[PDB]
Design a protein around this ligand. Structure first.
Ligand SMILES: CCCCCC/C=C\CCCCCCCC(=O)O[C@H](COC(=O)CCCCCCCCCCCCCCC)COP(=O)([O-])OC[C@H](O)COP(=O)([O-])OC[C@@H](O)CO
Ligand SMILES: CCCCCC/C=C\CCCCCCCC(=O)O[C@H](COC(=O)CCCCCCCCCCCCCCC)COP(=O)([O-])OC[C@H](O)COP(=O)([O-])OC[C@@H](O)CO
Ligand SMILES: Cc1cc2nc3c(=O)[nH]c(=O)nc-3n(C[C@H](O)[C@H](O)[C@H](O)COP(=O)(O)OP(=O)(O)OC[C@H]3O[C@@H](n4cnc5c(N)ncnc54)[C@H](O)[C@@H]3O)c2cc1C
Ligand SMILES: Cc1cc2nc3c(=O)[nH]c(=O)nc-3n(C[C@H](O)[C@H](O)[C@H](O)COP(=O)(O)OP(=O)(O)OC[C@H]3O[C@@H](n4cnc5c(N)ncnc54)[C@H](O)[C@@H]3O)c2cc1C
Ligand SMILES: O=C(O)c1cccc(O)c1
Ligand SMILES: O=C(O)c1cccc(O)c1
Ligand SMILES: [Cl-]
Ligand SMILES: [Cl-]
Lengths: 389, 389
């Protein structure tokens, strides 16, 4: 366990929250600083596969999350031009047995609030409206600076400040890499859908799934922005959606009418990095490994990061104390980097596979149609992973 | 049978020769005019699948052709970058039973000479060094003009003057369509090869097969020419081969050193046309349906054209006489156009599937690897076709 240890977390997204929970359940003294004036997430959906669900269950929050979630029966891929089914991934009891948990979908806002609340319950001290301005290591401590002029000492600091992480600059000068694709979301108060459906087409895709016991439908449009390639600064705006989808089936074109249009998510990732550690600071979540969303595992990775850190630290700290932290951070980095970096790189290829045109589309469609649906070789690496040693 | 009928064939390629044979075996009076001063073909290989082999057997020339041919055990597709096997088509006894004949490979020069000789044996009158300059229909005759000033009358004329057919201009003003790919051939006096091997890579492919009882190896390089896209008039020259293949496996790069470099075949086809008939002239072979070579069926199609024409004419002429010819030509066109035009259009897609790059290549490779190799659904339409009614 971790009662002698103090950890400061910079950032209160799903990642920071999950880490606060995991670490506080082990008895650690956790202080989290979130820049925003309140905790909150987008009132739209995310998908959480069993690689995340198993971990939420281990923290005792799964039943509660599920009470407000939806359990899809399948993931269904369809051709975006014809609407024909290409293949399904069955999410039933055989899937759940193999992977240790359900594939579920829920609101981001609810998952985030549930983690925050549980982190509070377990003894984590969460502070909104506080920005971390610097983190250094001096001797056997992380020294964290905040925007109110104060400095705080801890045994380690977690850099969990997202895709646009400034703390990542301590380790890497890289910039986000544009995919050239943008994402729009919508929910609409709810032919019928009880699955995650993904329509995959030339330079575009469209995803639908139910939320909250089937009352609402989550919709997401991902498309190649011509403005990006043309050098537009604020690229992927909604003027682009009609042409992006014009070649698709009616089922998909109808969907576009529900998207929220006042806001969108231009899709960027970063090139994978092996080293996440700077003294007694470690980058986790998107600050370390921000993906493109095709594997629906960014938030999941962050949740995995939390389980790994807390587990490995509870294992090592009880025998080595606060002197052990640099070895613990190294071990966590060693475990997590190959996993997450494969998700980054594979995710790029997987999205490219969605968006193929011409003959490449014809080959892709046939590949998906003819597969051995009883094999798990395309998904075990993702859903069957665990950090447990 | 056809003894009261006279047919003039314009062109003495594999097509014209096959037609002369088929028609002469039915008792027709055949006159063929070939522009070149002698009969002859390239001393390199072609492939003849059972859709052609069955027909050669029906004319009694297969055993003889095979005595000088090679019988590959498989068609083997390999990745051109890694050299790894993607899939095989087994050409064994189950294949031969299903399709009515062997898949064989031989020299073009030998197949052509064997057809000519058999056409001579069966009573066809072949004339070298004579160019057909015009063909018209007047009343119930085709009137054919030749370059020595003479005109010749026949019941029908076959326009078999190849890819650059001038007689096709009577029906269509289309021009050949560049694929942007060029082909090089080589033979070399013969790790070992007893199959047709096709290495398929990004913007390039490389084909190898044995000839003449395994003594010689036929090699063919097909690649995307950057000069074509850059507007070079005589595009696809040998200065382009080193860069075209630089990214490929050694097995393929070694092969390029054997190609004959003083001559190449820039690959063109034509858009499919439904109507091949102008009065009492019909376009057959490449004049009607010149393909890109990925289905290895251009000469085969021409041989099929000959069987169909001779069969349908022998069926109808015995009851309707020379008055029947326009109906016979219509029926032949009706049968052959959908078949051949599917080969044209599918052949384009099939070559595109060979030459995919990036993620599309990854999907293609997996498609080929995981297929049900006992299914014949991808090949029955090609190899199991017959004109017999
Ligand atoms: C499972 C859905 C259908 C996926 C269909 C085919 C996907 C990709 C084909 C290209 C990849 C071929 C890789 C061949 C080697 C292989 O199987 O590697 C295997 C690893 O494969 C891979 O690493 C495959 C990586 C690409 C596919 C990922 C599919 C993920 C499905 C998740 C969906 C998320 C949410 C959807 C939101 C709408 C290991 O094979 P082994 O034989 O060594 O064991
Ligand atoms: C047999 C070799 C491996 C081919 C692997 C997959 C090829 C193409 C995949 C894309 C086509 C998917 C078509 C799906 C529908 C289908 O199967 O149509 C089927 C028709 O398929 C087609 O029409 C397929 C056309 C494209 C493939 C042609 C393969 C020809 C192999 C010949 C090689 C020649 C020489 C090589 C020289 C090196 C009919 O299916 P159904 O279910 O209606 O019966
Ligand atoms: C369209 C889309 C769909 C997606 N769908 C899925 C999905 O279905 N499933 C999935 O698992 N993932 C998905 N993801 C990925 C997922 O949203 C992210 O990977 C994840 O939310 C990252 O969590 P995080 O806590 O690391 O970073 P963020 O969520 O970015 O949180 C960072 C937090 O740090 C705060 N902050 C920043 N700087 C400072 C500072 N200096 N001091 C203090 N606080 C600071 C920010 O205000 C913010 O709250 C999706 C992403 C997109 C864009
Ligand atoms: C690289 C490559 C590889 C190929 N491989 C294969 C394969 O493995 N299998 C396969 O089945 N096919 C293959 N083909 C296709 C095949 O070569 C052709 O489809 C076929 O030879 C066409 O035969 P043809 O008689 O219609 O036309 P051609 O062979 O073009 O014959 C036309 C003849 O007409 C003569 N002529 C022209 N104008 C006149 C005139 N006015 N008067 C008199 N005579 C005239 C010409 O001199 C010529 O001999 C390949 C083609 C290429 C380019
Ligand atoms: O919001 C999602 O669930 C999602 C999942 C995958 C890709 C994407 O753009 C979005
Ligand atoms: O010469 C061949 O056998 C051949 C077959 C297919 C494609 C190609 O370019 C050549
Ligand atoms: Cl994601
Ligand atoms: Cl051909």
């Amino acid at each position: 366990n971790l009662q002698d240890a103090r950890i400061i977390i910079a950032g209160g997204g799903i990642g920071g929250a999950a880490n606060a929970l995991a670490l506080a359940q082990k008895g650690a003294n956790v202080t989290l600083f979130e820049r925003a004036s309140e905790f909150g997430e987008v009132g739209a959906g995310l998908q959480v596969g069993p690689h995340g669900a198993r971990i939420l269950d281990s923290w005792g929050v799964l039943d509660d999350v599920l009470s407000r979630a939806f359990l899809p029966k399948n993931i269904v891929f369809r051709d975006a031009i014809t609407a024909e089914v290409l293949t399904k991934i069955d999410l039933g009891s055989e899937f759940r047995g193999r992977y240790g948990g359900p594939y579920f979908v829920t609101h981001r806002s609810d998952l985030h609030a549930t983690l925050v609340d549980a982190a509070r319950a377990a003894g984590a001290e969460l502070h909104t409206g506080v920005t971390v301005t610097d983190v250094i290591t001096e001797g056997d401590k992380a020294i964290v600076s905040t925007d109110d002029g104060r400095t705080h000492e801890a045994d380690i600091a977690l850099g969990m400040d997202g895709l646009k992480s400034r703390l990542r600059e301590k380790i890497s000068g890289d910039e986000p890499v544009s995919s050239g694709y943008a994402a729009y979301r919508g929910t609409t108060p709810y032919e019928d859908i009880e699955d995650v459906v993904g329509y995959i087409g030339p330079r575009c895709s469209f995803i639908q799934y139910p939320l909250r016991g089937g009352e609402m439908l989550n919709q997401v449009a991902v498309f190649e922005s011509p403005g990006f390639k043309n050098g537009i600064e604020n690229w992927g705006g909604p003027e682009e959606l009609e042409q992006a989808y014009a070649h698709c089936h009616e089922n998909v074109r109808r969907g576009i009418d529900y998207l929220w249009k006042d806001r969108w998510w231009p899709m960027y990732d970063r090139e994978p990095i092996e080293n996440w550690v700077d003294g007694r600071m470690i980058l986790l979540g998107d600050a370390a490994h921000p993906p493109l969303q095709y594997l629906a595992s960014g938030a999941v990775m962050a949740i995995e990061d939390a389980k790994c850190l807390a587990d490995y630290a509870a294992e090592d700290f009880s025998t080595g104390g606060n002197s052990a932290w640099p070895q613990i951070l190294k071990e966590v980095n060693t475990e997590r980097a190959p996993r997450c970096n494969r998700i980054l790189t594979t995710g790029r290829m997987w999205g490219e596979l969605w968006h193929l045109d011409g003959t490449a589309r014809i080959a892709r469609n046939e590949l998906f149609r003819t597969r051995d649906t009883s094999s798990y070789k395309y998904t075990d690496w993702l859903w069957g992973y665990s950090s447990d040693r």
